[PDB]
């Protein structure tokens, strides 16, 4: 059906250089991201090139583009692992000051009810950064939501 968008995701896949890799990726997405399955894998790859090669302000624009494809386009199974590993790369690489903006802006998109372990595991790990920060005020609101999720995890 959409044999076009599948191969331009794979044509813009190799590259090696970031140079113009992200412009040909965007020509896959912006052939109308109708289904959003190859709009996701176009942007997913753009993220792994943006944060790793210096440009985090440019990244967060594309980061929030990706988070649109959760209620539609992609299932929660694959989209769960997508943000997991993209935070694992930024967790070990950059520090608190570039990691915490993405933890918050993730949960903004996760205004979700059926997300239990998807919602809880981001919110549990938001409550760890706020202890190093000395941000105890908002940290209590985080713990109030966490505690109210159960009333395994209540420990």
């Amino acid at each position: 059906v959409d044999l076009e968008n599948q191969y331009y995701n794979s044509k813009a896949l190799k590259e090696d250089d970031p140079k113009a890799a992200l412009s040909s990726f965007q020509k896959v997405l912006e052939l109308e991201g109708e289904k959003g399955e190859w709009g996701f894998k176009a942007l997913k790859q753009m993220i792994k090139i943006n944060f790793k090669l210096t440009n985090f302000p440019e990244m967060m624009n594309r980061y929030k583009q990706l988070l649109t494809y959760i209620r539609s386009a992609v299932t929660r199974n694959y989209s769960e692992k997508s943000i997991n590993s993209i935070l694992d790369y930024i967790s070990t690489s950059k520090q608190m000051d570039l990691l915490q903006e993405f933890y918050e802006t993730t949960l903004e998109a996760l205004k979700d009810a059926k997300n239990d372990r998807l919602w809880f595991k981001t919110n549990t790990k938001l409550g760890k950064l706020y202890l190093e920060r000395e941000e105890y005020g908002k940290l209590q609101k985080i713990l109030r939501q966490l505690h109210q999720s159960c009333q395994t995890q209540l420990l």
Side-chain angles (χ1 to χ4, degrees), residues 95-145:
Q95 318 307 330
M96 178 192 74
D97 293 309
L98 268 168
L99 177 60
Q100 197 169 320
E101 283 67 29
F102 307 132
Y103 263 107
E104 293 175 11
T105 54
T106 294
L107 288 155
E108 288 171 15
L110 298 169
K111 47 152 177 168
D112 282 350
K114 305 302 175 190
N115 290 356
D116 283 312
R117 78 202 181 285
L118 286 72
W119 166 253
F120 181 86
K121 290 177 178 182
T122 313
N123 210 30
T124 304
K125 282 182 175 179
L126 185 69
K128 298 169 186 182
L129 293 166
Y130 279 49
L131 289 160
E132 292 288 324
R133 193 81 132 72
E134 309 178 322
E135 189 68 46
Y136 303 102
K138 290 181 176 174
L139 179 56
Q140 286 173 52
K141 188 197 168 190
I142 295 165
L143 289 161
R144 270 173 279 179
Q145 293 175 307

Coordinates of all heavy atoms in Angstrom, one line a residue, residues 95-145:
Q95 N 23.4 15.1 31.7 CA 23.2 15.1 33.1 C 21.7 15.4 33.4 O 20.9 15.4 32.6 CB 24.1 16.2 33.8 CG 25.5 16.2 33.2 CD 26.2 14.9 33.3 OE1 25.9 14.0 34.1 NE2 27.2 14.6 32.4
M96 N 21.4 15.7 34.7 CA 20.1 16.1 35.2 C 19.5 17.3 34.4 O 18.3 17.3 34.1 CB 20.2 16.5 36.7 CG 18.9 16.9 37.4 SD 19.3 17.7 39.0 CE 20.0 19.2 38.5
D97 N 20.3 18.3 34.1 CA 19.9 19.5 33.5 C 19.4 19.4 32.0 O 18.7 20.3 31.5 CB 21.0 20.6 33.6 CG 21.2 21.0 35.0 OD1 20.3 21.3 35.8 OD2 22.4 21.0 35.4
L98 N 19.7 18.3 31.4 CA 19.1 18.0 30.1 C 18.2 16.7 30.1 O 17.6 16.4 29.1 CB 20.2 17.9 29.0 CG 20.5 19.2 28.2 CD1 21.8 19.0 27.4 CD2 19.4 19.6 27.3
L99 N 18.2 16.0 31.2 CA 17.4 14.8 31.3 C 16.0 15.1 31.9 O 15.0 14.4 31.5 CB 18.1 13.8 32.2 CG 17.4 12.5 32.6 CD1 17.1 11.7 31.3 CD2 18.2 11.7 33.5
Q100 N 15.9 16.1 32.7 CA 14.7 16.3 33.5 C 13.6 17.0 32.7 O 12.4 16.9 33.0 CB 15.0 17.2 34.7 CG 13.9 17.1 35.8 CD 14.3 17.7 37.1 OE1 15.5 17.5 37.6 NE2 13.4 18.5 37.8
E101 N 13.9 17.8 31.6 CA 12.9 18.4 30.8 C 12.1 17.4 30.0 O 10.9 17.7 29.7 CB 13.6 19.4 29.8 CG 14.0 20.7 30.5 CD 15.1 20.6 31.5 OE1 15.9 19.6 31.3 OE2 15.2 21.4 32.4
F102 N 12.8 16.3 29.6 CA 12.1 15.3 28.8 C 11.3 14.3 29.7 O 10.3 13.8 29.2 CB 13.2 14.5 28.1 CG 14.1 15.3 27.2 CD1 15.5 15.1 27.3 CD2 13.6 16.3 26.4 CE1 16.3 15.9 26.5 CE2 14.4 17.1 25.6 CZ 15.8 16.9 25.7
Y103 N 11.7 14.1 31.0 CA 10.9 13.4 31.9 C 9.5 14.0 32.2 O 8.5 13.3 32.3 CB 11.6 13.1 33.2 CG 12.3 11.8 33.3 CD1 13.7 11.7 33.2 CD2 11.6 10.6 33.5 CE1 14.3 10.5 33.3 CE2 12.2 9.4 33.6 CZ 13.6 9.3 33.5 OH 14.2 8.1 33.6
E104 N 9.5 15.3 32.3 CA 8.3 16.1 32.5 C 7.4 16.2 31.3 O 6.2 15.9 31.3 CB 8.7 17.5 33.0 CG 9.3 17.6 34.4 CD 9.8 19.0 34.7 OE1 9.4 20.0 34.1 OE2 10.5 19.1 35.8
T105 N 8.0 16.6 30.2 CA 7.3 16.7 28.9 C 6.8 15.4 28.4 O 5.9 15.4 27.5 CB 8.1 17.4 27.8 OG1 9.4 16.8 27.6 CG2 8.4 18.9 28.2
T106 N 7.3 14.3 28.8 CA 6.8 12.9 28.5 C 5.4 12.7 29.2 O 4.4 12.4 28.6 CB 7.7 11.8 29.0 OG1 8.9 11.9 28.2 CG2 7.1 10.4 28.8
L107 N 5.4 13.0 30.6 CA 4.2 12.8 31.4 C 3.1 13.8 31.0 O 1.9 13.4 31.2 CB 4.6 13.0 32.9 CG 5.4 11.8 33.5 CD1 6.2 12.3 34.7 CD2 4.5 10.7 33.9
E108 N 3.4 14.9 30.4 CA 2.4 15.8 29.8 C 1.6 15.2 28.7 O 0.4 15.3 28.7 CB 3.1 17.1 29.3 CG 3.7 18.0 30.3 CD 4.5 19.2 29.8 OE1 4.5 19.4 28.6 OE2 5.3 19.8 30.6
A109 N 2.3 14.5 27.9 CA 1.7 13.7 26.8 C 1.0 12.5 27.4 O -0.1 12.0 26.9 CB 2.7 13.3 25.7
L110 N 1.5 11.9 28.4 CA 0.9 10.7 29.1 C -0.2 11.1 30.0 O -0.4 10.5 31.1 CB 2.0 9.9 29.9 CG 3.2 9.3 29.2 CD1 4.2 8.8 30.2 CD2 2.7 8.2 28.3
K111 N -1.1 12.0 29.6 CA -2.4 12.2 30.3 C -3.3 11.1 30.0 O -4.3 11.2 29.2 CB -3.0 13.6 29.9 CG -3.0 13.9 28.4 CD -4.2 14.8 28.0 CE -4.1 15.2 26.5 NZ -5.4 15.8 26.1
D112 N -2.9 9.9 30.5 CA -3.5 8.6 30.1 C -4.1 7.9 31.3 O -3.5 7.9 32.4 CB -2.5 7.8 29.4 CG -2.3 8.2 27.9 OD1 -3.0 9.0 27.4 OD2 -1.3 7.7 27.3
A113 N -5.2 7.1 31.1 CA -5.8 6.4 32.2 C -5.5 4.9 32.1 O -5.2 4.3 33.2 CB -7.3 6.6 32.0
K114 N -5.4 4.3 31.0 CA -5.1 2.9 30.8 C -3.6 2.6 30.9 O -3.2 1.4 31.0 CB -5.7 2.3 29.5 CG -7.2 2.6 29.3 CD -8.0 1.9 30.4 CE -9.5 2.3 30.3 NZ -10.3 1.9 31.5
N115 N -2.8 3.6 30.7 CA -1.4 3.5 31.0 C -1.2 3.4 32.6 O -1.4 4.4 33.3 CB -0.6 4.8 30.5 CG -0.5 4.8 29.0 OD1 -1.0 3.9 28.3 ND2 0.0 5.9 28.5
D116 N -0.9 2.2 33.0 CA -0.6 1.9 34.4 C 0.9 1.8 34.7 O 1.4 2.7 35.4 CB -1.3 0.6 34.9 CG -2.8 0.8 35.1 OD1 -3.2 1.7 35.7 OD2 -3.6 -0.1 34.6
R117 N 1.6 0.9 34.1 CA 3.0 0.7 34.2 C 3.8 1.6 33.3 O 5.0 1.9 33.4 CB 3.4 -0.7 34.0 CG 3.5 -1.2 32.6 CD 3.4 -2.7 32.4 NE 3.5 -3.1 31.0 CZ 2.5 -2.9 30.1 NH1 1.3 -2.3 30.4 NH2 2.7 -3.3 28.8
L118 N 3.1 2.1 32.2 CA 3.6 3.1 31.3 C 3.7 4.5 32.0 O 4.7 5.2 32.0 CB 2.8 3.2 30.0 CG 2.9 2.1 29.0 CD1 2.3 0.8 29.5 CD2 2.3 2.5 27.7
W119 N 2.6 4.8 32.7 CA 2.4 6.0 33.5 C 3.3 6.0 34.8 O 4.0 7.0 35.1 CB 1.0 6.2 33.9 CG 0.7 7.3 34.9 CD1 0.4 7.0 36.2 CD2 0.8 8.7 34.8 NE1 0.2 8.2 36.9 CE2 0.5 9.2 36.0 CE3 1.2 9.5 33.7 CZ2 0.5 10.6 36.3 CZ3 1.2 10.9 34.0 CH2 0.8 11.4 35.2
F120 N 3.3 4.9 35.5 CA 3.9 4.7 36.8 C 5.4 4.8 36.7 O 6.1 5.4 37.6 CB 3.4 3.4 37.5 CG 4.0 3.2 38.8 CD1 3.4 3.7 40.0 CD2 5.2 2.4 39.0 CE1 4.0 3.5 41.2 CE2 5.7 2.2 40.3 CZ 5.1 2.8 41.4
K121 N 6.0 4.1 35.7 CA 7.5 4.0 35.6 C 8.2 5.3 35.2 O 9.4 5.5 35.6 CB 7.9 2.8 34.7 CG 7.5 1.5 35.3 CD 7.8 0.3 34.4 CE 7.5 -1.0 35.0 NZ 7.8 -2.2 34.1
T122 N 7.5 6.2 34.5 CA 8.0 7.5 34.2 C 7.9 8.4 35.4 O 8.8 9.2 35.7 CB 7.3 8.2 33.0 OG1 7.2 7.2 32.0 CG2 8.0 9.4 32.6
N123 N 6.8 8.2 36.2 CA 6.5 9.1 37.3 C 7.4 8.6 38.6 O 7.7 9.5 39.4 CB 5.0 9.0 37.7 CG 4.5 10.2 38.3 OD1 5.0 11.3 38.1 ND2 3.4 10.1 39.1
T124 N 7.7 7.3 38.6 CA 8.6 6.8 39.7 C 10.0 7.4 39.5 O 10.7 7.7 40.5 CB 8.7 5.3 39.7 OG1 7.4 4.7 39.8 CG2 9.6 4.8 40.8
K125 N 10.4 7.5 38.2 CA 11.8 8.0 37.9 C 11.8 9.5 37.8 O 12.9 10.1 37.7 CB 12.3 7.3 36.6 CG 12.8 5.9 36.8 CD 13.3 5.3 35.6 CE 13.9 3.9 35.9 NZ 14.5 3.2 34.7
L126 N 10.7 10.2 37.8 CA 10.7 11.6 38.0 C 10.9 12.0 39.4 O 11.4 13.0 39.8 CB 9.3 12.2 37.5 CG 9.2 13.8 37.5 CD1 10.2 14.4 36.5 CD2 7.8 14.2 37.3
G127 N 10.4 11.1 40.3 CA 10.6 11.3 41.8 C 12.0 11.0 42.3 O 12.2 11.2 43.5
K128 N 12.9 10.5 41.5 CA 14.3 10.3 41.9 C 15.1 11.5 41.6 O 16.0 11.9 42.3 CB 14.8 9.1 41.2 CG 14.1 7.8 41.5 CD 14.5 6.6 40.6 CE 13.6 5.4 40.9 NZ 14.0 4.2 40.1
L129 N 14.9 12.2 40.4 CA 15.6 13.4 40.0 C 15.3 14.6 40.9 O 16.2 15.4 41.1 CB 15.2 13.8 38.6 CG 15.7 12.8 37.5 CD1 15.0 13.2 36.2 CD2 17.2 12.9 37.3
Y130 N 14.1 14.6 41.5 CA 13.7 15.7 42.4 C 14.4 15.7 43.7 O 14.3 16.7 44.5 CB 12.2 15.8 42.5 CG 11.5 16.4 41.3 CD1 11.8 16.1 40.0 CD2 10.5 17.4 41.5 CE1 11.1 16.7 38.9 CE2 9.8 18.0 40.5 CZ 10.1 17.6 39.2 OH 9.5 18.2 38.1
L131 N 14.9 14.5 44.1 CA 15.6 14.4 45.4 C 17.0 15.0 45.3 O 17.5 15.7 46.2 CB 15.7 13.0 45.8 CG 14.4 12.4 46.3 CD1 14.4 10.8 46.3 CD2 14.0 12.8 47.7
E132 N 17.7 14.8 44.2 CA 19.0 15.4 43.9 C 18.9 16.9 43.6 O 19.8 17.7 44.0 CB 19.6 14.8 42.6 CG 20.0 13.3 42.8 CD 21.3 13.1 43.6 OE1 22.2 14.0 43.6 OE2 21.3 12.1 44.4
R133 N 17.8 17.3 43.0 CA 17.5 18.7 42.8 C 17.3 19.5 44.0 O 17.6 20.7 44.0 CB 16.2 18.8 41.9 CG 15.9 20.1 41.2 CD 16.7 20.4 40.0 NE 15.8 20.9 38.9 CZ 15.3 22.1 38.8 NH1 15.5 23.0 39.7 NH2 14.5 22.4 37.7
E134 N 16.8 18.9 45.1 CA 16.3 19.6 46.3 C 15.0 20.3 46.0 O 14.7 21.4 46.5 CB 17.3 20.6 46.9 CG 18.7 20.0 47.1 CD 19.7 21.0 47.6 OE1 19.7 22.2 47.2 OE2 20.6 20.6 48.5
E135 N 14.1 19.6 45.2 CA 12.8 20.1 44.8 C 11.7 19.3 45.5 O 11.0 18.5 44.9 CB 12.7 19.9 43.3 CG 11.5 20.6 42.7 CD 11.5 22.1 42.7 OE1 12.6 22.7 42.4 OE2 10.5 22.7 43.1
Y136 N 11.6 19.5 46.8 CA 10.8 18.6 47.7 C 9.3 19.0 47.6 O 8.5 18.1 47.9 CB 11.3 18.7 49.1 CG 12.7 18.3 49.3 CD1 13.7 19.3 49.5 CD2 13.1 17.0 49.3 CE1 15.1 18.9 49.6 CE2 14.4 16.6 49.5 CZ 15.4 17.6 49.6 OH 16.7 17.2 49.8
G137 N 9.0 20.2 47.2 CA 7.6 20.7 47.1 C 6.8 19.9 46.1 O 5.8 19.3 46.4
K138 N 7.3 20.0 44.9 CA 6.6 19.3 43.8 C 6.8 17.7 43.9 O 5.9 17.0 43.4 CB 7.2 19.7 42.4 CG 6.8 21.1 42.0 CD 7.3 21.5 40.7 CE 6.8 22.9 40.2 NZ 7.5 23.3 38.9
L139 N 7.9 17.3 44.5 CA 8.1 15.9 44.7 C 7.0 15.2 45.6 O 6.7 14.0 45.4 CB 9.5 15.7 45.4 CG 9.9 14.2 45.7 CD1 9.9 13.4 44.5 CD2 11.3 14.2 46.4
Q140 N 6.4 16.0 46.5 CA 5.3 15.4 47.3 C 4.1 15.2 46.4 O 3.3 14.2 46.7 CB 5.0 16.3 48.5 CG 6.1 16.2 49.6 CD 5.9 17.3 50.7 OE1 4.8 17.4 51.2 NE2 6.9 18.0 51.0
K141 N 3.8 16.1 45.5 CA 2.7 15.9 44.6 C 2.9 14.7 43.7 O 1.9 14.0 43.4 CB 2.5 17.2 43.7 CG 1.3 17.2 42.8 CD 1.3 18.2 41.7 CE 0.2 17.9 40.7 NZ 0.4 18.7 39.5
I142 N 4.1 14.4 43.3 CA 4.5 13.2 42.5 C 4.2 12.0 43.4 O 3.6 11.0 42.8 CB 5.9 13.3 42.1 CG1 6.2 14.4 41.1 CG2 6.3 11.9 41.4 CD1 7.6 14.8 40.8
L143 N 4.6 12.0 44.6 CA 4.3 10.9 45.5 C 2.9 10.7 45.9 O 2.4 9.6 46.2 CB 5.2 11.0 46.8 CG 6.7 10.8 46.6 CD1 7.4 11.4 47.8 CD2 7.0 9.3 46.5
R144 N 2.1 11.8 45.9 CA 0.6 11.7 46.1 C -0.1 11.0 45.0 O -1.0 10.3 45.2 CB 0.1 13.1 46.3 CG 0.0 13.6 47.7 CD -0.4 15.0 47.9 NE 0.7 16.0 47.6 CZ 0.6 17.3 47.6 NH1 -0.5 17.9 47.9 NH2 1.7 18.1 47.3
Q145 N 0.3 11.2 43.7 CA -0.2 10.6 42.6 C 0.2 9.1 42.6 O -0.6 8.2 42.3 CB 0.2 11.3 41.3 CG -0.3 12.6 41.1 CD 0.2 13.4 39.9 OE1 1.5 13.5 39.7 NE2 -0.7 13.9 39.0

